[PDB]
């Protein structure tokens, strides 16, 4: 794989959000979107106006500017979605290099990818050494997503679906806390209210 | 989830789609690496994944000369049946295939 | 524990190995712990902890 | 004679080299006292007692 042509014109891309495995954020969105070309128009949540266009390389300035607006669902161009035949377009790759500018027309990127994965291979290990409920960390608002709910005898909202997700929406509108709530959990809250920092939002028996 | 246990990436692609399976692979390998504290950008695994899915199996030949169960690389059938789609003749349908490295 | 225009105060230690550990030059918390304190627990070839 | 790197000590966790260094320093101090006794030749008595 090389940089055969600069562009192909594909509008396909991937959505980027701060990664959360069901606890706190383990890597910010700025680490995952920096140095990549946007894949779509950029708007505030209420379509105030277009902040960034569809082809601006998101370098440090634009990363900070997005940090000001704080929208955290960013469609960005990727290598897999590239329309280029028998090669990769320079825009869908991104800009990363030892140098800070965009990738040059011709650099062999697949070999560099393989070496980049290979260097941490030494730091790994062939054989391993030996090996109740949700506690919110920051202060925010409960947002129940993909969940069926029912009011039990006590009045506490209980969950009747397995795919239940729980988000913490703060006063800006971002999502820093995401959790997966099992079926048959107890929620003293529901979708729409506000909770304190460290306040227990929901409990269930682990077994 | 119709049951539990780890899943096979080929079926993950076959049901959810391309972006889902590449997201799964990059996220899982990022977890494994991040546990040992090695920073690696998602781009390299992106390009590895693009080269992993390069092959795809034809489903319907249509107006093409492909075989009903032939496995050809995505880009080749892409350009061919795309020129036939720009033409009047009906194109050929395919299904993305996941091949190990 | 040191005195400055006064009786006593305390600060981050100037001990050599602690500087080598905190600065990130050479070492981490575990190695310093093992040079000084009781050293954890191992396992038999089966993996069963001692 | 030699200038070693102290940083090589904590990361590699071989403190026995430091004990060997201290004990060799001590033994050489004993030998230097003995050589001083040799040059300022006193007698069999003082050397034997030492």
């Amino acid at each position: 794989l090389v940089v055969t042509e600069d562009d192909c014109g594909t509008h396909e891309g991937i959505m980027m959000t701060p990664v959360i495995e069901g606890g706190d954020v383990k890597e910010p969105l700025r680490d995952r979107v920096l140095g990549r070309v946007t894949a779509e128009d950029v708007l505030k949540p209420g379509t105030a106006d277009i902040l960034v266009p569809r082809n601006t390389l998101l370098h440090e300035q634009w990363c900070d500017l997005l940090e000001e607006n704080s929208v955290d669902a960013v469609k960005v161009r990727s290598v897999v979605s590239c329309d280029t035949d028998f090669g990769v377009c320079a825009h869908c790759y991104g800009r990363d290099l030892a140098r800070g500018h965009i990738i040059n027309k011709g650099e062999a990127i697949g070999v560099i990818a393989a070496q980049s994965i290979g260097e941490p291979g030494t730091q790994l290990t062939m054989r391993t050494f030996h090996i109740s409920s949700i506690q919110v960390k920051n202060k925010g608002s409960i947002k129940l997503s993909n969940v069926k709910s029912v009011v039990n005898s006590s009045g506490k909202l209980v969950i009747t679906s397995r795919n239940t997700e729980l988000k913490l929406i703060d006063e800006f509108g971002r999502t820093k806390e995401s959790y997966k709530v099992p079926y048959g959990a107890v929620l003293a809250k529901g979708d729409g209210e506000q909770v304190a920092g460290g306040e227990t939002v929901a409990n269930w028996d682990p077994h | 989830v119709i049951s539990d246990g780890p899943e096979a990436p080929h079926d993950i692609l076959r049901l959810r789609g391309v972006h889902a399976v590449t997201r799964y692979i990059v996220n899982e390998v990022q977890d494994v690496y991040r546990l040992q504290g090695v920073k690696i950008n998602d781009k390299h695994i992106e390009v590895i994944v693009r080269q992993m899915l390069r092959k795809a199996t034809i489903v319907n030949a249509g107006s093409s000369d492909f075989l009903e169960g032939e496995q050809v690389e995505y880009s080749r059938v892409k350009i061919a049946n795309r020129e036939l789609e720009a033409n009047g003749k009906v194109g050929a349908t395919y299904s993305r295939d996941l091949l190990g490295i | 524990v040191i005195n400055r225009d006064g009786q006593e105060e305390k600060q981050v230690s100037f001990n050599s190995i602690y500087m080598m550990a905190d600065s990130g030059a050479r070492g981490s918390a575990a190695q310093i712990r093992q040079l000084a304190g009781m050293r954890g627990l191992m396992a038999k070839p089966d993996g069963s902890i001692i | 004679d030699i200038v070693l790197n102290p940083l090589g000590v904590p990361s590699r966790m071989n403190i026995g080299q430091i004990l060997e260094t201290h004990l060799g320093m001590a033994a050489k101090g004993i030998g230097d006292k003995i050589n001083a006794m040799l040059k300022q030749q006193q007698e069999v008595a003082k050397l034997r007692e030492f």
């Binding site: 730091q123 391993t128 | - | 575990a30 190695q31 191992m42 | 990361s11």
Partner: peptide, 21 residues
């Protein structure tokens, strides 16, 4: 401990793992 050149067999479970010199 750190500065990965040999692994640390001795640790409480859950730590990433050294990777010690």
């Amino acid at each position: 401990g750190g500065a990965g050149h040999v692994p640390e067999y001795f640790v409480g479970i859950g730590t990433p793992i050294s990777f010690y010199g």
